[PDB]
Amino acid sequence: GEVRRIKLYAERLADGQMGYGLEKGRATIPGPLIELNEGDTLHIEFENTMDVRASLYVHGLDYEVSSDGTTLNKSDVEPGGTRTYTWRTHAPGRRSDGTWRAGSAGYWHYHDHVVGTEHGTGGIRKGLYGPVIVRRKGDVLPDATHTIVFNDMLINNRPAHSGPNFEATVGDRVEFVMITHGEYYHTFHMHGHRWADNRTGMLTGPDDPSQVVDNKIVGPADSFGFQVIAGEGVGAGAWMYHCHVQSHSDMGMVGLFLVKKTDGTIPGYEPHEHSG
Amino acid sequence: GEVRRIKLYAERLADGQMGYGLEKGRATIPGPLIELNEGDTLHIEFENTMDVRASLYVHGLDYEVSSDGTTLNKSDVEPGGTRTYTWRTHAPGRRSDGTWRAGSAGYWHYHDHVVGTEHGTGGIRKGLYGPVIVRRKGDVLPDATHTIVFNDMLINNRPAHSGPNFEATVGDRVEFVMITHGEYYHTFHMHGHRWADNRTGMLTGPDDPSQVVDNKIVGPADSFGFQVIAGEGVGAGAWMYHCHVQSHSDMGMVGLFLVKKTDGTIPGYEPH
Amino acid sequence: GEVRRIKLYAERLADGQMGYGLEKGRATIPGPLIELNEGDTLHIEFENTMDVRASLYVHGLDYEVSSDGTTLNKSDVEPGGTRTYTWRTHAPGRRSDGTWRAGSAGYWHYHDHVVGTEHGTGGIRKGLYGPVIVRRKGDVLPDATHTIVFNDMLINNRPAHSGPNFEATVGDRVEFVMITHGEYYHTFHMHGHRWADNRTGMLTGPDDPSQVVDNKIVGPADSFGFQVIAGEGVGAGAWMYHCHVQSHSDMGMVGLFLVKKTDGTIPGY
Numbered sequence A: 001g002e003v004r005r006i007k008l009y010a011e012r013l014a015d016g017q018m019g020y021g022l023e024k025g026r027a028t029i030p031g032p033l034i035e036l037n038e039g040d041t042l043h044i045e046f047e048n049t050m051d052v053r054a055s056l057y058v059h060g061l062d063y064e065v066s067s068d069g070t071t072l073n074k075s076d077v078e079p080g081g082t083r084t085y086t087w088r089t090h091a092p093g094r095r096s097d098g099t100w101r102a103g104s105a106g107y108w109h110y111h112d113h114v115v116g117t118e119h120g121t122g123g124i125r126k127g128l129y130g131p132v133i134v135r136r137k138g139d140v141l142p143d144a145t146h147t148i149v150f151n152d153m154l155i156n157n158r159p160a161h162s163g164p165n166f167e168a169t170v171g172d173r174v175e176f177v178m179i180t181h182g183e184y185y186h187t188f189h190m191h192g193h194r195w196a197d198n199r200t201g202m203l204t205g206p207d208d209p210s211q212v213v214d215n216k217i218v219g220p221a222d223s224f225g226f227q228v229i230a231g232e233g234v235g236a237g238a239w240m241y242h243c244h245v246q247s248h249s250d251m252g253m254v255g256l257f258l259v260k261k262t263d264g265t266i267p268g269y270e271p272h273e274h275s276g
Numbered sequence B: 001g002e003v004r005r006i007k008l009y010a011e012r013l014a015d016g017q018m019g020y021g022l023e024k025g026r027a028t029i030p031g032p033l034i035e036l037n038e039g040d041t042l043h044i045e046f047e048n049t050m051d052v053r054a055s056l057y058v059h060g061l062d063y064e065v066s067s068d069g070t071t072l073n074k075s076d077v078e079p080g081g082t083r084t085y086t087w088r089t090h091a092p093g094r095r096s097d098g099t100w101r102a103g104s105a106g107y108w109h110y111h112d113h114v115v116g117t118e119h120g121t122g123g124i125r126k127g128l129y130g131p132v133i134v135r136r137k138g139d140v141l142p143d144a145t146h147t148i149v150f151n152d153m154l155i156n157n158r159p160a161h162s163g164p165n166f167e168a169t170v171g172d173r174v175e176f177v178m179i180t181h182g183e184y185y186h187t188f189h190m191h192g193h194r195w196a197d198n199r200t201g202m203l204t205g206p207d208d209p210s211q212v213v214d215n216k217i218v219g220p221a222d223s224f225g226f227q228v229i230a231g232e233g234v235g236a237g238a239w240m241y242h243c244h245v246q247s248h249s250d251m252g253m254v255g256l257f258l259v260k261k262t263d264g265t266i267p268g269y270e271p272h
Numbered sequence C: 001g002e003v004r005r006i007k008l009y010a011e012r013l014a015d016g017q018m019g020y021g022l023e024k025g026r027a028t029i030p031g032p033l034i035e036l037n038e039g040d041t042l043h044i045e046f047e048n049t050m051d052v053r054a055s056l057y058v059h060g061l062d063y064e065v066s067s068d069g070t071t072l073n074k075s076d077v078e079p080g081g082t083r084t085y086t087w088r089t090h091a092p093g094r095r096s097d098g099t100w101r102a103g104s105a106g107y108w109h110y111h112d113h114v115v116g117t118e119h120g121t122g123g124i125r126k127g128l129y130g131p132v133i134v135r136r137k138g139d140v141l142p143d144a145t146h147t148i149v150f151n152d153m154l155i156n157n158r159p160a161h162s163g164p165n166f167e168a169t170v171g172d173r174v175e176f177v178m179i180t181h182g183e184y185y186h187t188f189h190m191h192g193h194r195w196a197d198n199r200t201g202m203l204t205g206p207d208d209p210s211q212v213v214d215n216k217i218v219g220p221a222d223s224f225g226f227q228v229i230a231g232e233g234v235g236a237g238a239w240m241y242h243c244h245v246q247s248h249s250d251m252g253m254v255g256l257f258l259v260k261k262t263d264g265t266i267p268g269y
Ligand SMILES: [Cu+2]
Pocket: A113, A119, B191, B240, B242
């Protein structure tokens, strides 16, 4: 239960894009990864540097309507303006009615709710989205975290057939956050790696009946995550991840999970010719 | 459990849609909420008041082919006709083979299966759908139940941007039944509220590893439900619910969960 | 953990189709059911009898990049060629750090990855798909296993309104393996029967909180499966399974689960 404070900016980027950043001129798509433990409060001093109204809306976490980020609750931000949004989180526990209050932990995301339409359609399209992870006490922490957003037919708003690729070494505990936005359903698939369809992506134990999958149907505003042990049972290699909707894969919704041997090498990776 | 009877009518509405109702002239879209406990048997004395054949088809519950509500099993209803549909339910238990037979309990739905096409495409389009909840012993009961149906691009057949809205007070245990129909996938989203992706929509305890979500992909004939504590950790307010497919929200697949303070007041909001 | 070997062939079929088989000239769509228990290894000696490159890619199981079936990892097969693919599987267990490694068990599937495109788009369209079941120790075995593949708008590449139908007797333990491919989402729906949305399709016991469903949204390359007791609580009947996407049911994405009395008859059928 720490109270934490950050600045965030929305900015226009080149080529008709928009993004969030931790400093002016440093906006990225996806936006910065926000990580909190259950019980933490985060105050985000948000500045809209753009010429259109913009907002910050978050899935999963606790907020009052004054931090809804909506036209409806008059909690977006005028051009050039500043607003502090507050996100709270809670741990799980038993209610006075005997039921179990689910905690805030999970794989969540934030995004704009007012650019283009009062649902943020244009803001989302242009890049105003990012990942938020809320951890539960005791959760295992990864060696690296990678964010994959399927935004209509693009991955992280990159051009078709441009990745992103992510590197690891065999044995690394690698976390993926997978967010979808826009108009289309997708199926997220990874070669060589599987996860549990539950909160953490890992089965809790032999009593966990969660389904174990390597392919998952997602639609706009869905978020999930998981951890894998890179190359577990499969070894090193260039391991594709892709949408499995066939025309989407063919049109470029593919990237590589590049898993190195501990000697540094990737089996089969031969970028250059050799004489003779 | 208990043996029960209701009357149900299919009616063409004054605006030309089609609805089920517990009485003549009182059809609604969605149709009336049916609620059963596992073991209960329900006999539905159904009358088709319309000029085309209509039927009653239920997900999840136990019925014989004579209550399939289909043409294939000769169990639709002629115009002006009557037929008694029987729905049974069972509790969970151990089979003699050692496996666990799942109970009937869940968030289910009924709909027409013969209006327009032999899959009820017309009937469903026009409003012939409704919720059924089968409860397990010990299930927690809510203060209120609200049914949200994404039927093609409409919510409960309401015009674009016309709700429905649902009102509650802070702290109320509110149940939602969420059913999809037609041609389109959607994603159901609620502002300010979350639930577990499991039978009841509530975690059973610290050992339940179910996903806790505020957004869920659904397709035709999917049904789920959940209960929230209205405004828990978030306060009173107009809390939007909407499809999160961007063009669908923009086209009007939005409504409000209006959570009031215990003095009846709400923070000011500015609706469409 | 047994080591098993099989042969597999990819063959062209009529109407521009393509399929896998366990014997030359016996290719089917879907391909043959492959069944393994956790820990088993399978070596598949694969021959591509066709005149274009083709491959074999599997979901869920353990393989090295030399068995990925992809151009990327130079593991497809040239026209008329042969290659041995190796699938391994593993049981669940605890890692040295105390975390739980999920097992390979599940309802999985295999398909082509290089016909038509580098994602096997044409291969899959034409019929190069089939089911693989990996069982865990103690799993209940069924009387029969039926495979239902929604491949674009066709079931098992059959023409509209042409089933397939599957027959059982009241009380039989019947397993379904349900795979989706291509471009479209679907909702898989069965009349008169329900299953748990977990690994086996049956709840593990009274503490399993998995949703119990009769309708499930699926997209390309999804796979799941379940077991039912045929007619349980509902009796004998012609019990439709269908996509519940209304135009898709109307256009023929429908079959029958024909559940017979012990005397062999069915109600008004
Ligand atoms: Cu919203």
